[PDB]
Amino acid sequence: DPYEDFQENWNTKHSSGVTRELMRELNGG
Amino acid sequence: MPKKNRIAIYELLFKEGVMVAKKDVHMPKHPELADKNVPNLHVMKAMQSLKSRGYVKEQFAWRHFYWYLTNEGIQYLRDYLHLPPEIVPATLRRS
Amino acid sequence: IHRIRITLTSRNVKSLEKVCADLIRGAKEKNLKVKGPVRMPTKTLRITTRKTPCGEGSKTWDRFQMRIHKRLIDLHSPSEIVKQITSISIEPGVEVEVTIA
Amino acid sequence: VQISKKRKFVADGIFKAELNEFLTRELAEDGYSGVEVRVTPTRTEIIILATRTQNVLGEKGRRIRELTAVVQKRFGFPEGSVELYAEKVATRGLCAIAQAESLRYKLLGGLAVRRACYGVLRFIMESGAKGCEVVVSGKLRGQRAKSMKFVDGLMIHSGDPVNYYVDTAVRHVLLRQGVLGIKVKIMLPWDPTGKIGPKKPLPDHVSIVEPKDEILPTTPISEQK
RNA sequence: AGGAGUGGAGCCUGCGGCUUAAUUUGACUCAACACGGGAAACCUCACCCGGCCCGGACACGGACAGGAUUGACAGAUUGAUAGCUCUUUCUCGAUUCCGUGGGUGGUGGUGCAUGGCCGUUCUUAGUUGGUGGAGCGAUUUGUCUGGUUAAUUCCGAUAACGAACGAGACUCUGGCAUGCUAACUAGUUACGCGACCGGUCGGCGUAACUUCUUAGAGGGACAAGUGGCGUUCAGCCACCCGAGAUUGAGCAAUAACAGGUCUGUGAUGCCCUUAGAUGUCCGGGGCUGCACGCGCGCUACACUGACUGGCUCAGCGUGUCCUACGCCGGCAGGCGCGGGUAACCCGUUGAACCCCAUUCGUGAUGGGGAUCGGGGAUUGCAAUUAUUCCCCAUGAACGAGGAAUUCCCAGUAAGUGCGGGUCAUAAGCUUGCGUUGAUUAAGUCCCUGCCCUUUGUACAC
C-alpha cells in the first residue's frame, strides 16, 4: 500500500522511493 | 495396545461420528467406553494416530479433546465394520 | 391440601419480579388464596482477586459479586392446577422449583 | 439431594463459559457470534448465533448434527434434552465478535492494515453505530512493536453506560513472525428496543419537546357544548 | 496543629549476603522486599542425588513369523516385590525394533521479538477534530487577562461557533418513610393454656397486623428558603426547617514507559533440548540451612495494669463438611446419635476489649513470654528439619526506644474480637465485618513534588 508505505517511511532511507510510488499511485499513469 | 480395545472405538464413530476425551494420561478408565476396561491413554493416543492419517478433526478446549468424522471416514469405516450402505446413520433421519 | 410452595430464584431482579407479578396475577385469575411473594435475604458471593497476573504492581484488588435474589410464592390449591400455571410464563435467566404437600 | 443454590448458580456459569470457548474455537470461521442457553428440564436448548447460518448446518442439516452429539456426550446430560438452533444474527456490523473475526480474514488474507481497518470501520459506521474503535497491535512493520488506533464517531470509556452501550472483542491473529492482537469496540445506538442498542438513553442526554402554539385568546368565549 | 507509631528488644515472615550436593527463580526509588493468592513435611517443584517409561505420531528401507516386543518367581545387585540388569530361559503372535527422514512435549532461554492482562505518568485535569477567522507558511484562535470550582467546573469578556472524550452525570452502597406492597423459613400485639411468685417466661397453640425483620416499587435534597459577601455573575459563608446541607467505593481520556509478566494459559515467534531426555514418573533430600546487613509485621515493656470468678451485648460470612444433643476424660480429644444442599440446622450465630467484685501493689514482680526437657492427642502413606494442639516445668532481653521516617481530618485514627482466601493438618499474612471510640485542623506553598504565565538560550538525544 503506497499510502501506508509513505506514512511509515517518509523519514527513513526509503523516503524518496515511497514518495515516487505515492505520486505514481496518485497521478495516474 | 491390544487389538480388542481399538475395535469398539470405531462403532460410535459411524452412527454419530464424534468422540471426546479428557487429556488425562493416568486416568485408568475412559468412562464412555465402560465395560471394556480401556484407559483414557489408549483412546487418546489411538486418535492421535488417527489424526496423522487424517481421519479425525482436531479441536481442543479447556480440557477435552474433540474429534469429528471426516467425509472420507465413512467409506473407511463401512468396510472395516463390513457394513452395507443400505442402513443410514443419524445423518438422514429427520426431514 | 397444605404447603404448596413455589421457589423462584434468579440472578437479576427485574425479570424475577416480572415472573413473580405474572404468577401472582395468574393465581388471582384462578381465584385461590395466595400468600404473596415473600423476599428471602439476598445472597451476594464475594470473590476478591489480585488484579495483576504476575505480582509486580501496586497491589490493586478486584471485587466480583453475584446477587441471587430468591422469592417464594405460596398457594393452597390442589395439585392439578399448580402445574398449569407454572408452565405458561417460561422465561430465561430465572429458575423455577415447586414443592407439593 | 441436589446441590446448593450458591453452587448451582455458579455451575450454570462454568457451563456457558466452556461452551462459548469451545464454540469460538470451532466456529471461528463461519462467523460465530454467541450462544443463548435456554434451560428447561425437558430440553436445554442452545441457540447458536451466526453470520451465515445456512452454512453452519452443513448439507441439509449435517454439520450441527455432529455438535449435538458432542455437547450430548460431553456434559453428561443424556440425549433428547438439547436442541441446537443456528440463528442468523440481527446485524453483523453491530457485533464486535463478528467484526473482529472479519478483520482476521482480511489480515490473514494479505491486505494492508489501513484499508482493512478502514473498511471494517466504514462498514460499522454505515451499519448504524454511534461510533467505533479498532486497535491493531503487534509487529506490524519491522520487529519493534507498534499499535494503530482507528477512532471513528463517539466512544464511552467511563461509568456504568460502558457496560451496555459498548461491546468489546479481543482476537489474536497468528501471522508468520508473531501474534497480532486486535481489539474492536462498537458504541451501540439508541432505539428503545428494536432489538438493537439499549432501551435506556445516555444518562446525561436531556431531550426537550417542542411546545405547540396554543391559540391565543382575545375575548372571553363562553362556549357551551 | 496533633494522634498512633515504625526505626530500639524478642519473635514471625520477605529480600540480600555466607555456606550448600541443591539451598529453583522472577521482581531492586516512588513504579522490588507478608509480592509472584509463594502459609512448599510427599506431591506441589522448578533445584540436587539416583532409578524406571516412551507418552518418538507419521513416511521410507531392513529384521521379519526360524519370531521384534512384554511380564518376569528364586538367587545376585538395588532404595524397591524397579525384570532395571546376569543366571534361572518360559509366556507375550509383531501391539515392535533398528537406521534415514520429522515430529512431539518442555514452570528451558529471550517480557529488548510479540499478544493479552496489569502497574505508572494520573486519578492529576487534561485532550481533540469539524466549520469559521488570522497568517506566504510552519502555525494559531477556539483551549482566555480575570473571578469561581473538587474539576478546561462555570461565569464573564471575546473571531469564534458549536460539539466530543476525560470531569460530572452513571452504577453499587449508607442514612429517612408508623405512606404502599407483602410475609408458618421473619415476627410484634392480644387471647387462652402451662409453670413460679397482678408481675417473668427464647414457654405452647391460635387470632389482628407489619412498628420491629426481610426486599421491592416510589418518594426525599435542589445551595430550594432567609441574611450577608459577590463586574450583587458564577458562586462562597451562616442559619432555619429537615433523616440527610461532604456517605463510601466502582468505572475512568489522548499520548506514553525500551515498567512487569513466555513461571497462568492447547496466547505465541525464533533459539535450545528430545531416549547416560532440560519430556515424564518413582524415591530421597532441598526450598527453612546462618558469623552479618535491610524491609513489612506480632508480642510487649505494666497499676489507664495482671490473675480468678460473675454479668452482658454483634455484623459481614462460610457449610456434604458445618455442627446441635447424651456419655468418658485435666484438656486437647474419644464415642454414638440427629439436623442442614441451607432467613428452616449449627444459631438467639450466648465473641473480645468494655463492665462488676477478689487477689496482687511499682521490684526485672506473679509484667513479658522467648529458649529448652518430658509426656499426651489429632490430620495424614509418612510428623525426626519440633506440621499443628493440650498439660507440667525453665525463665531471656525488654525500664517507652538516637539519626531518620510512615499513615491519617469522623463512626476517622487507635483498641478489640469474628469471618473469607490459602486449608488433609493449618494464620502472626491478606481481604472483609462488627464492637469501643477520641485529640487536633478546617489553612498555606515553607519543605516534598506537580502544573501554568512572563525570561533567554550555544538547545531540537
The cell for D55 is 452454512
From the list D6, D9, D40, which residue is nearest C11 (CB)?
Answer: D9
Report how far residue D122's alpha carbon sits from residue D133's, in angstroms, rounded to the nearest whole number.
Answer: 11
DSSP, collapsed to helix, strand or coil, labels residue C8 as strand
Residue D129: how many other CB atoms lie within 10 Å: 24
CA distances for B11 relative to B20, B52, B57, C89, D151, angstroms: 14, 20, 17, 43, 55
The method recorded for this entry reads cryo-EM
Dihedral through CA C15, CA C18, CA C23, CA C28, nearest 10?
Answer: 180
**D141–A8: do the CB atoms touch at under 8 Å?**
yes
- Closest nucleotide to the alpha carbon of D137, via C1': E115
Q: Are residues D93 and D124 in contact, defined by beta-carbon separation less than 8 angstroms?
A: yes
The answer to whether strand E lies under 7 Å from the CB of residue D3 is yes
Residues 3-22 of C with CB under 8 A from D: 9, 11
Alpha helices in chain B (DSSP H): 3-6, 41-53, 73-80
Neighboring chain A residues of D141 at a CB cutoff of 8 Å:
8
Breaks, C-N > 2.5 A, in chain C lie after none
- Sheet of strand D32-38, all strands in order from the earlier edge strand to the far edge: D32-38, D45-50, D84-88
- Count of H helices and E strands in chain C? 2, 5
The Å distance, CA of C60 to C1' of E246, is 26
In chain D, positions 130-189 with C-beta closer than 7 Å to nucleic chain E are 135, 137-139, 143-145, 147, 149, 154-162, 170, 172, 174, 176-183
The cell for D120 is 471494517
Residues 2-31 of B with CB under 8 A from D: 16-18, 20
Alpha helices in D93-221 (DSSP H): 96-100, 102-108, 113-127
Number of domains chain C contains? 1
Q: Are residues D185 and D167 in contact, defined by beta-carbon separation less than 8 angstroms?
A: yes
Dihedral through CA D195, CA D201, CA D206, CA D210, nearest 10?
Answer: 10
| CA D77 to centroid of chain Cα atoms | 29
C61: DSSP letter? B
Q: Are residues C89 and C19 in contact, defined by beta-carbon separation less than 8 angstroms?
A: yes
Residue B53: how many other CB atoms lie within 10 Å: 11
| C-alpha R_g of chain C | 19
Q: Are residues D117 and D99 in contact, defined by beta-carbon separation less than 8 angstroms?
A: no
CATH topology of domain D5-88: GMP Synthetase; Chain A, domain 3 (3.30.300)
Residues of chain D with a CB closer than 8 angstroms to some CB in chain C? 5-6, 8-10, 36, 38-40
DSSP, collapsed to helix, strand or coil, labels residue B64 as coil
Helix, strand and coil in chain C, % to nearest 5 = 25, 35, 45
CA distances for D27 relative to A4, D24, D102, D133, angstroms: 32, 5, 13, 24
Report how far residue C31's alpha carbon sits from residue C53's, in angstroms, rounded to the nearest whole number.
Answer: 58
DSSP D64-130: HHHHHHHHHHHSSPPSSS--EEEEE-S-STT-HHHHHTHHHHHHHTT--HHHHHHHHHHHHHHHT-S
The answer to whether strand E lies under 7 Å from the CB of residue C61 is yes
Q: Are residues C19 and C52 in contact, defined by beta-carbon separation less than 8 angstroms?
A: no
3-state SS of C25-50 is HHHHHCCCCEEEEEECCCEECCECCE
| Domain boundaries, position B35 | 1-95
- Count of H helices and E strands in chain A? 2, 0
- Closest nucleotide to the alpha carbon of C51, via C1': E118
Site from D21, D22, D59 to mutate, B interface, most B CB atoms within 10 angstroms: D22
| C79-86 and C14-29 helices, crossing angle to 10° | 140
DSSP, collapsed to helix, strand or coil, labels residue B79 as helix
Report how far residue C46's alpha carbon sits from residue C48's, in angstroms, rounded to the nearest whole number.
Answer: 6
Q: Are residues C57 and C27 in contact, defined by beta-carbon separation less than 8 angstroms?
A: no
Q: Are residues C9 and D9 in contact, defined by beta-carbon separation less than 8 angstroms?
A: yes
Report how far residue D132's alpha carbon sits from residue D126's, in angstroms, rounded to the nearest whole number.
Answer: 11
Q: Are residues C36 and C19 in contact, defined by beta-carbon separation less than 8 angstroms?
A: no
B23: DSSP letter? -
Which nucleotides of strand E come closer than 7 angstroms to any CB of the protein? Answer: 26-27, 31-32, 35-37, 55, 57-59, 94-95, 113-120, 164-171, 181-185, 214-217, 250-256, 259-261, 263-264, 266-270, 281, 316-320, 341-343, 420, 431-432
Residue type, C44: T
The cell for A17 is 522511493
Residue type, D11: A
DSSP, collapsed to helix, strand or coil, labels residue B6 as helix
The answer to whether strand E lies under 7 Å from the CB of residue C2 is no
The answer to whether strand E lies under 7 Å from the CB of residue C24 is no
DSSP C48-59: --BS-SSS-SS-
Report how far residue D184's alpha carbon sits from residue D95's, in angstroms, rounded to the nearest whole number.
Answer: 10
**D36–C92: do the CB atoms touch at under 8 Å?**
yes
Report how far residue D20's alpha carbon sits from residue D154's, in angstroms, rounded to the nearest whole number.
Answer: 29
Rounded (5°) CA angle B63-B69-B73: 140
The cell for B40 is 483414557
CA distances for D83 relative to B22, B81, C64, C92, D69, angstroms: 24, 30, 32, 15, 11
Cited resolution, angstroms: 3.0
| Domain boundaries, position C26 | 1-101
Breaks, C-N > 2.5 A, in chain D lie after none
Q: Is A3 on the interface with D (CB under 8 A)?
A: yes
Q: Is B64 on the interface with D (CB under 8 A)?
A: yes
- Sheet of strand B65-69, all strands in order from the earlier edge strand to the far edge: B19-20, B65-69, B56-60
Residue D112: how many other CB atoms lie within 10 Å: 15
Strands (DSSP E) along D120-206, which ranges?
131-138, 146-153, 166-174, 179-187
Phi-psi group of D28: left, alpha or beta (phi > 0 → left; psi -120 to 50 → alpha; rest → beta): alpha
CA distances for B61 relative to D72, D83, D170, D225, angstroms: 16, 21, 18, 78
CA distances for D118 relative to D51, D136, D175, angstroms: 21, 12, 20
